[model samples]
Target: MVLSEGEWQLVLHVWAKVEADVAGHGQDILIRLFKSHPETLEKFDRFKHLKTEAEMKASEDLKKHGVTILTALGAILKKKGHHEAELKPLAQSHATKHKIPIKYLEFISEAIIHVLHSRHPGNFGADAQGAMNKALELFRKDIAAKYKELGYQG
Candidate 1:
């Protein structure tokens, strides 16, 4: 499925909020993810030992990774008409170096949805939510396909 011009507009608009504080949004998104699926927390060396929210909040590792994630999102959004080629390297990296499952793509993006919805009700309308979901789903599928092609074990 393809997004209309209006839909991209909706997504990019609210993304300004995400862009304003990539660190904050990243921290919030991952924290929410861990809160729901703490087992996923073990994947991060920097965050695995974090037992309390305060530890997560004070974690330079978490905050830095947050910046990395939000920056990647911005990169993805900027390459609207072309995704697969752009995301291929990321897919490859995750399968090899990251060893993180593409499955958590669902969890991470869900956290993003909730983060934007609760934090920016005025901007994250149903239409925006729909657009973001579609885009994120595409992102997940492209990477997953590449992982499958590479015979990823994780």
Candidate 2:
């Protein structure tokens, strides 16, 4: 699922528009994640103690984690062909210590795409969306393979 030169530009181009607010967008993705997977609320010890979405959003811990994810994604999008390689170890750690369902990655991807689409309205075109889906698809596949290797379940 390596991106062609054109597809590479597509991802980077669209990402550039929102890259400056990566941290905020990352938190938004997590917010979306919580809505889709309420069980995840308990997965984060720091977040689980909170009583509401606003509490979660205001937590420094959430902001830190949020900033980190989007930073990693920035590197991955910029790297293109070699993108998935760096993600394996991070995914492997979650598979083991974090014990996260590998499916969560796909959920995050969907949220990110949803964010991008809604933000730009008519500017975020289908070609860019399709391009990003392939990137996320490959991202999920790499984690899926590594999770299977480590005998991690969904």
Candidate 3:
């Protein structure tokens, strides 16, 4: 999906609002993702046994990692649309070094979309959502291609 320049601008604007409080928004989104998808817990050692809300909240390292992931996402977004060079490092690290599955990536996209809506309330509309979906679809495709090249079947 190729977003119009206007649509891209909308996405950027909405993202700026959410990114303003990266640590807060990022950690909340991660918590939402984990709550919405309990099976994702096994993927992160730090959060593996964090089933209760108290456990999840006390996982400071997990929250910090959420901030780190969001920071990288901000870097990718700052590149103004997709660039293989900008995305390749992230793809390699997550898919190869960390061996994170594609499903988790999908969940990350879902979490981000949720955060945008929750952060901006009425301000985040369809155009912004479409742009973000397109951007993440492109990101996932790029990562999948690189993962395949690296012989990662999972």
Candidate 4:
């Protein structure tokens, strides 16, 4: 489960093409991961519900905040480690706050990748993986900056 930077890059390379209905490799990886680890289903319930309702919602402010937090958190997951040991701990925290199991998070990630694969099936090999990795890097930077701006460091 030890993932070097290059391995991280490969995942990002696949994930980057997940958008625009371009490729499905990233989706494939995600799906396989979830299939092997079904426990994640209970951890990400909130996200699944939100993803379904994010559209046609009247609470713009609430939705925006949730999306921002989710994007930030997901970016963290995409950073280091192949198995992502921190995911369960983070899911525990998220579950306590949201009153849902940590397994739901995996479920949400699975659904998203599934959607991408079904919608887009093409040459989404390295580009998406690179983008996914880079996006995570940028997201981590943004969060660090935000925390610094708020006079918080951890």
Candidate 5:
């Protein structure tokens, strides 16, 4: 899935809105993931025991991790075509140290699309969604390659 500069700009434009309130937006994404996919919460040690949305939002670790994840995403977008050097190591770490499945990353990307659609009903059109999906697909491809390189079966 190739994207044009204009398409990338479309994604970045909407993402800028998201980044403006990263703490809040990031937390919302995580909360949506937990609600939509409860099993995903089990993958995170800090959030595993959290049973409520309020608890999830209030946790310092939750906020910190959300920022980390969202910032990593911003970094990926910042270097769209050649993000392997930045993302591959994180993928390897996630696969080897964190034991996170590649599928979960894909799931989170879908959750991101869901959030975008809901948050910006007027702005998130098909083109914007496609750009996000392609960007995330790039991440997934990099991560999967790294995971295979590490000999992790996920």
Candidate 6:
């Protein structure tokens, strides 16, 4: 999916917030996710070895990947559905290369939405909720597909 210029701006803003670690960004997204939805986080937290600060620092680096993947998916969302894009494989590759725990994948989404909602509360409402719902659906689909490609049972 190729992100339209407009959608890329939104995703860029989201990525920027992640990189900046802006106030309320990290906890809002991640903490809220764990509280609101524990099941998703359950699949991938057993091997978490990094300290919180280290995790934050690591998450900051995903800005580029976020832009690349989101823009690609946004560009193609209307045509083939964003989940069919390469995000999961991209993430799985990164995880394999780094030996990172797969649980971190779900955390990334929760974190992104948390930051987007926390820092830009006014920007979200029914539309934001609905859009993010769809976004998450696509995200999980990709995650499952990538796990399959990696020969891991989901």
State every prediction's TM-score relative to the real structure. Answer: 0.94, 0.89, 0.89, 0.41, 0.93, 0.47
Model 5 TM-score?
0.93
Angstrom error of the Cα, residue 53, model 2: value is 2.0
Using TM-score as the measure, the top candidate is 1
Which pairs clash (backbone N, Cα, C closer than 3 Å) in model 2? none
C-alpha lDDT score of every prediction, in listed order: 0.86, 0.80, 0.79, 0.43, 0.84, 0.50
RMSD of each: 1.4, 1.7, 1.7, 10.2, 1.3, 6.9
lDDT of 2 by residue, 1-104 (tens): 67798988888888887787877888888888887777877778777786778877888888789888888878877888675578777777888888887667
Give the candidates in order of lDDT, highest first: 1, 5, 2, 3, 6, 4
lDDT of 3 by residue, 29-68 (tens): 8888889888787778766877787787778888898889
Best by lDDT: 1
Candidate 4 worst ten-residue window by lDDT:
47-56
For model 4, the local distance difference test gives: 0.43
Q: Please provide, for model 5 over 13-93, each residue's C-alpha lDDT reduced to its tens digit, 9 standing for 90 to 100.
A: 888888878887788888888888899999888779999999997898998888899998898887856787887779777
Clashes of each: 0, 0, 0, 24, 0, 8
**Inter-residue clash pairs, candidate 3:** none
In angstroms, the error of model 1 at 21 is: 1.2
**Candidate 2 local lDDT, residue 128:** 88
lDDT of 1: 0.86
**Which regions of candidate 3 deviate over 4 angstroms?**
none
